Enzyme design. Structure first.
Site: not given
Ligand SMILES: [Ca+2]
Ligand SMILES: [Ca+2]
Ligand SMILES: [Cl-]
Ligand SMILES: [Cl-]
Ligand SMILES: [Cl-]
Ligand SMILES: [Cl-]
Ligand SMILES: [Kr]
Ligand SMILES: [Kr]
Ligand SMILES: [Kr]
Ligand SMILES: [Kr]
Ligand SMILES: [Mg+2]
Ligand SMILES: [Mg+2]
Lengths: 386, 386
Positions: B53, B56, B87, B180, B182, B216, B219, B244, B254, B256, B286
């Site tokens: 991102h 980040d 990506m 994406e 969710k 994902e 998700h 993902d 979530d 992950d 992810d």
């Protein structure tokens, strides 16, 4: 109070009030209902019309003569009360031949039979005045991962719907199709599980304009989704051809409770959206009077479906008409969402320093949305506590 | 054994191994990681690349000089290791300004800011070699029914994606977008909640060919959906631009978890599908190393993501190559599913008495699908128990 009348467009499946009560761990608790009695009793309660699966009206395996007898008496009841038949569908899930699906059965001979069974009932639906032909692919899917190649199954599903579109076009019928999603039950996972998946699939059909969705309150809630949001997306796409109304209490087996029951707040927001958007299709109830009930309870549950729609309609209208609510909507900037973000265009946006370089992110972040006051006004209106 | 190498195309977000462990009920358990260290350590474990991102890589609010230094250091680490950046995405959810969304915030000034923030990062992503630009609209949605006019919100979402499409086309960039989905979390309900809803929405954009999905695992599983089925629909639509990978244990927050964890059988069927379909994009993780772990545990968890994909790839390939499995697929008529239902055409189907009048429905219904034997061979292959 809250007495339904035919102009409310409330409709019921023959299989709803006719549900004998056989569930996953129990035998029937009620005798079978004659479709003629259901037409008359629903007309007396203020319904606009009824819907049917082929096999609800004509016993599976009926000869042409028997078929004619069943249809004739049903049509006489419709002619006597003025009840309409706005939607019809095919039973591609009860008979054991459909154990692995109709349109997406692995056996090709079953897929061909499913299409022929469907086409026969499309002709009958057209004769009876249906505007929408629903498809609920309840047996399309799998319990295990290797049993169904989903890409091939979607090719078969597209092929079936394309053939049906070719059929209605070749016959000059004005009827349109509506896919009714369900995420699971009776199959472990059902193909086209939600409103989204059905909307997406329709865009791959040869004549996409002939197909829309028939979303069911309880089905989207079986995936934990927000039904009013899904209905907004279907309306936004121009695809809300029909709707199935009922209640569901969370993520579990498909309850098909009377409308209003289950998620009451979602029912309120759903009615608010349908009325504000001007949805003009049938307000169809796909519900099962609980098997605890006798026939009086069946009619009391059917009447409750309509009553709850009307109470919610009145509360949503009062909510939207309240100047205090309109003030709260303005305070929460609901109207600003309707303004284009950048009608000035891409270059203007890129050159606008107020959109980035000089944007006061902290001042914007500090502005409360005032959503809680708005929602409490909505709660007050729903409960009649203003 | 099962050692990942760069041609396996395993990629990781900077935010994954860099997750400090802060959750709403607890403080960080790990110190912040320098992106340069993440690039180096992931390359040593056999990763193909990393994703990010904007925030980040470049701390929010960074000056131009600060921005250039962060990017220069990161580029040097990529240059040194050969790690790719396939990506990138925008953080339109952490800063309090995005509390009601980025592209669909009720406040118009926030929507414009979200677009400017995204466009700035598209330029950087393109420079670093990204082929896909992801959008996760985690703040798009609501907690209460009156807070968001969903039709207006979808108009705003379309407007935003159309402007981004206009932007990449005007610059001559070959980058494509991936939405994406969710269903919920951080908002009570998120817009475009599943693969289906995102696929449908893309068909209303001005240049639909530029947009696909980045589904994902966890998700879709937060809506109780079958992830392999959703991936099959995305592949069928030609829209699986990226993916993902992670683990999730049912319907809840979530998680992950590292890939392989959570629903292991679904992970097997997912890998079987990706490899059988020839998906060529990144195998992107992810995931969040649980906050119980120290840095050694972070790298062990990242290695486990890749290891589990490779074990499952081996078992799915052995399953498909086994002559006994090929026989079981024939016994279950997976081959018939791939044949058109009626390539003879509508008229031939209507005239075919074998598809209706002379169809032996009871003989067809009596045929077992043999799905349990097939699934037990799949189980034996996954567990190495053949
Ligand atoms: Ca239902
Ligand atoms: Ca996640
Ligand atoms: Cl009873
Ligand atoms: Cl309310
Ligand atoms: Cl720790
Ligand atoms: Cl397996
Ligand atoms: Kr249909
Ligand atoms: Kr699709
Ligand atoms: Kr984006
Ligand atoms: Kr849509
Ligand atoms: Mg229904
Ligand atoms: Mg993700």
């Amino acid at each position: 109070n809250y007495q339904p009348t035919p102009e409310d467009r409330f409709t019921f499946g023959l299989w709803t009030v006719g549900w004998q009560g056989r569930d996953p761990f129990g035998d029937a608790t009620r005798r079978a209902l004659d479709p003629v009695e259901s037409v008359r009793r629903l007309a007396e309660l203020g319904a606009h019309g009824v819907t049917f699966h082929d096999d609800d009206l004509i016993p599976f395996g009926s000869s042409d003569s028997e078929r004619e007898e069943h249809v004739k008496r049903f049509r006489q009841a419709l002619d006597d009360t003025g009840m309409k038949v706005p939607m019809a569908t095919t039973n591609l899930f009860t008979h054991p031949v459909f154990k692995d699906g109709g349109f997406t059965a692995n056996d090709r001979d079953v897929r061909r039979y499913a299409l022929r069974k469907t086409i026969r009932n499309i002709d009958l639906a057209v004769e009876l005045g249906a505007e929408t032909y629903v498809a609920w692919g309840g047996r399309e899917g799998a319990e295990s991962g290797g049993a169904k190649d989903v890409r091939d199954a979607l090719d078969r599903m597209k092929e079936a719907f394309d053939l049906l579109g070719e059929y209605v076009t070749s016959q000059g019928y004005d009827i349109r199709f509506a896919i009714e999603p369900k995420p699971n039950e009776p199959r472990g996972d059902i193909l086209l599980p939600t409103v989204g998946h059905a909307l997406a699939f329709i865009e791959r059909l040869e004549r996409p304009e002939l197909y829309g969705v028939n979303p069911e309150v309880g089905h989207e809630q079986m995936a934990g989704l927000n039904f009013p949001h899904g209905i907004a997306q279907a309306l936004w796409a121009g695809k809300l051809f029909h709707i199935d109304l009922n209640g569901q209490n969370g993520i579990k087996y498909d309850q098909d409770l009377r409308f209003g029951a289950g998620d009451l707040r979602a029912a309120f927001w759903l009615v608010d959206l349908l009325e504000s958007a001007g949805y003009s299709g049938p307000r169809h109830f796909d519900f099962k009077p609980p098997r605890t009930e006798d026939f009086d309870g069946v009619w009391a549950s059917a009447a409750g479906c309509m009553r709850n729609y009307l109470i919610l309609k009145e509360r949503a209208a009062a909510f939207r008409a309240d100047p205090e609510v309109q003030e709260a909507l303005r305070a929460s900037r609901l109207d600003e969402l309707a303004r284009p973000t950048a009608a000035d265009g891409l270059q203007a946006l890129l050159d606008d320093r107020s959109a980035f370089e000089e944007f006061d992110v902290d001042a914007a972040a500090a502005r409360g949305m005032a959503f809680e006051r708005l929602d409490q006004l909505a709660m007050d209106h729903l409960l009649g506590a203003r």
